[PDB]
Amino acid sequence: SYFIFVLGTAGSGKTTLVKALQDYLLNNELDTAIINLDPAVEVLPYKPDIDAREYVDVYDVMNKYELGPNSSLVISVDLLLTKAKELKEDLNQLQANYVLVDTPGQIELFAYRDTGKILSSFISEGSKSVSVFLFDSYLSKDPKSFLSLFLLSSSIKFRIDMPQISVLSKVDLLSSSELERMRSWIEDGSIIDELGSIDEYSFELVKTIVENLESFPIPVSSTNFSGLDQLYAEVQKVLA
Amino acid sequence: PSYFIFVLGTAGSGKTTLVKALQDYLLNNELDTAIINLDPAVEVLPYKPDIDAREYVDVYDVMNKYELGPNSSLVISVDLLLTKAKELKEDLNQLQANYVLVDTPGQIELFAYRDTGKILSSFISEGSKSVSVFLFDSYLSKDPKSFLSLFLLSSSIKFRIDMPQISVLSKVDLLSSSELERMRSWIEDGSIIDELGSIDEYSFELVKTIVENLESFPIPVSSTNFSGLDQLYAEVQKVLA
Numbered sequence: 001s002y003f004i005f006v007l008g009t010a011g012s013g014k015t016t017l018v019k020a021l022q023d024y025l026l027n028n029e030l031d032t033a034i035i036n037l038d039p040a041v042e043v044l045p046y047k048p049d050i051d052a053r054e055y056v057d058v059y060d061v062m063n064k065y066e067l068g069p070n071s072s073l074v075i076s077v078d079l080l081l082t083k084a085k086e087l088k089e090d091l092n093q094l095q096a097n098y099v100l101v102d103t104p105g106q107i108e109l110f111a112y113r114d115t116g117k118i119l120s121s122f123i124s125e126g127s128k129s130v131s132v133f134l135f136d137s138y139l140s141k142d143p144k145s146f147l148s149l150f151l152l153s154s155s156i157k158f159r160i161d162m163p164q165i166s167v168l169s170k171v172d173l174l175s176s177s178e179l180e181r182m183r184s185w186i187e188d189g190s191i192i193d194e195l196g197s198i199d200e201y202s203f204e205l206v207k208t209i210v211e212n213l214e215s216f217p218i219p220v221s222s223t224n225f226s227g228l229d230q231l232y233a234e235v236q237k238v239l240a
Numbered sequence: 241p242s243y244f245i246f247v248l249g250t251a252g253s254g255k256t257t258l259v260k261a262l263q264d265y266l267l268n269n270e271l272d273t274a275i276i277n278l279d280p281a282v283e284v285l286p287y288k289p290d291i292d293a294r295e296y297v298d299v300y301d302v303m304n305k306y307e308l309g310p311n312s313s314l315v316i317s318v319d320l321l322l323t324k325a326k327e328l329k330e331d332l333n334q335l336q337a338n339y340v341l342v343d344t345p346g347q348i349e350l351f352a353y354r355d356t357g358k359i360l361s362s363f364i365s366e367g368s369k370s371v372s373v374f375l376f377d378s379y380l381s382k383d384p385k386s387f388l389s390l391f392l393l394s395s396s397i398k399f400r401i402d403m404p405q406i407s408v409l410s411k412v413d414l415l416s417s418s419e420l421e422r423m424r425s426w427i428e429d430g431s432i433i434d435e436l437g438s439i440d441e442y443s444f445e446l447v448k449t450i451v452e453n454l455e456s457f458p459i460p461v462s463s464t465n466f467s468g469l470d471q472l473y474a475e476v477q478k479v480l481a
């Protein structure tokens with residue numbers, strides 16, 4: 001069994017990539033299941049084999065405790081730890097070599113809460129796991145926001161202790177010219193010239209990123225169905 | 241002379257409680273401070289806000305008007321504050337205070353990594369100096385790897401919210417004196433390198449850059465013990481000068 005964890009900011013394309021990656025993998029004759037760990041997602045574009053909404057009803061939490069949407073979201077994600085026993089039980093009943101794991105919409109509720117570390121380590125126990133972090137192309141158009149995503153993706157890795165592949169998601173929102181500037185920003189280091197006013201600390205952080213980064217984030221577009229061959233190949237290399 | 245203090249941090253790291261404690265410290269020193277709450281989904285507030293986002297955007301109205309769930313409604317509700325920005329500054333100018341405490345939404349992601357955050361933060365503090373305060377949750381900081389993840393997160397937020405940022409170690413009453421001293425030596429002396437296990441070269445070079453270039457340890461503050469607020473305000477003043 002192989003576990004692929006899809007991470008990223010809200011609306012960065014996690015859920016859509018899970019459906020698009022599943023279609024690519026099933027088209028290439030690999031049986032993949034999907035676990036949805038978002039107990040508050042309204043509409044899913046795929047058929048999840050395990051649905052967190054079947055374990056924790058965020059609407060039940062709202063009125064049982066008389067809390068608002070924000071508190072209920074935090075409480076609902078935390079309740080997944082109490083339902084982890086059933087989660088791993090339903091894992092063994094699925095027989096697939098690859099398992100895609102869709103995470104809650106807000107990565108903060110997953111990575112920076114103990115539920116994230118425990119659940120991800122508990123369900124991938126005895127299996128190989130890899131995480132995929134989505135760089136929102138819309139956020140990456142600005143060089144400072146682009147660099148903030150690199151620091152964010154590095155932060156998540158320190159919380160979720162598993163290898164992480166970087167993906168530039170929703171890349172169809174970019175022109176060929178926009179990608180070339182973003183590519184040269186990191187591959188050459190020209191983002192230094194277009195960085196505005198920085199403190200020495202943050203400037204030293206950017207220096208470390210550009211000079212020590214091994215590869216650019218994989219440009220993927222779930223709607224154009226592009227980059228999934230590169231993403232799958234990078235997943236394979238990590239899993240070896 | 242109006243000063244805006246934006247309080248940031250992970251969910252449950254103590255932003256709202258610190259806003260009350262900071263207001264209490266400033267009022268004890270006879271400094272007229274107002275509070276803006278920008279969280280449209282908070283149930284109970286421990287302070288009395290001069291501007292409340294819940295009076296401009298009703299998150300429950302958004303839920304059934306749009307027929308969406310809590311997650312989507314939260315995102316839309318935070319975004320709707322931009323439609324109410326005209327009214328927002330109108331009620332702000334009615335305040336004459338030297339310090340304006342800004343309480344942000346519970347999830348820092350909904351604020352920092354959404355375009356609403358910078359626009360709101362830049363719009364209401366127009367014509368004034370602003371400083372940001374990022375809360376390091378002490379409970380998360382007990383683990384050396386999670387501690388470092390907070391340093392990378394706080395640095396990421398600074399690249400999104402373009403204003404000076406003061407780092408605070410919040411909820412420090414959850415730590416023993418020994419735990420706090422170990423966390424200080426972890427970063428100030430670099431001994432955290434030894435307590436990192438085996439990590440990739442990229443992450444290791446990032447840790448090195450943090451330890452060797454960090455200017456100061458985060459200010460240990462405890463809102464429940466009402467400690468460290470003298471250090472925070474002094475650092476706020478030094479930045480605002």
Ligand SMILES: Nc1nc2c(ncn2[C@@H]2O[C@H](COP(=O)(O)OP(=O)(O)O)[C@@H](O)[C@H]2O)c(=O)[nH]1
Nearest residue numbers: 010011012013014015016105170172221222223
């Ligand atoms: N252009 C483009 N839009 C996308 C892509 N993937 C997702 N989206 C859109 O982005 C919005 C949010 O995506 P979603 O899958 O919900 O991201 P999530 O919240 O992280 O799970 C949806 O309305 C999608 O239509 C993509 O590859 N390209």
Ligand SMILES: Nc1nc2c(ncn2[C@@H]2O[C@H](COP(=O)(O)OP(=O)(O)O)[C@@H](O)[C@H]2O)c(=O)[nH]1
Nearest residue numbers: 251252253254255256257346411413462463464
């Ligand atoms: N022990 C301790 N608990 C705190 C402190 N500040 C806040 N809390 C608790 O942390 C929880 C979340 O605090 P809150 O201010 O709402 O966090 P926020 O989401 O960032 O606004 C609350 O239950 C508080 O009681 C503190 O200084 N010490």
Ligand SMILES: [Mg+2]
Nearest residue numbers: 014015041105
């Ligand atoms: Mg989703």
Ligand SMILES: [Mg+2]
Nearest residue numbers: 255256282346
């Ligand atoms: Mg709060």
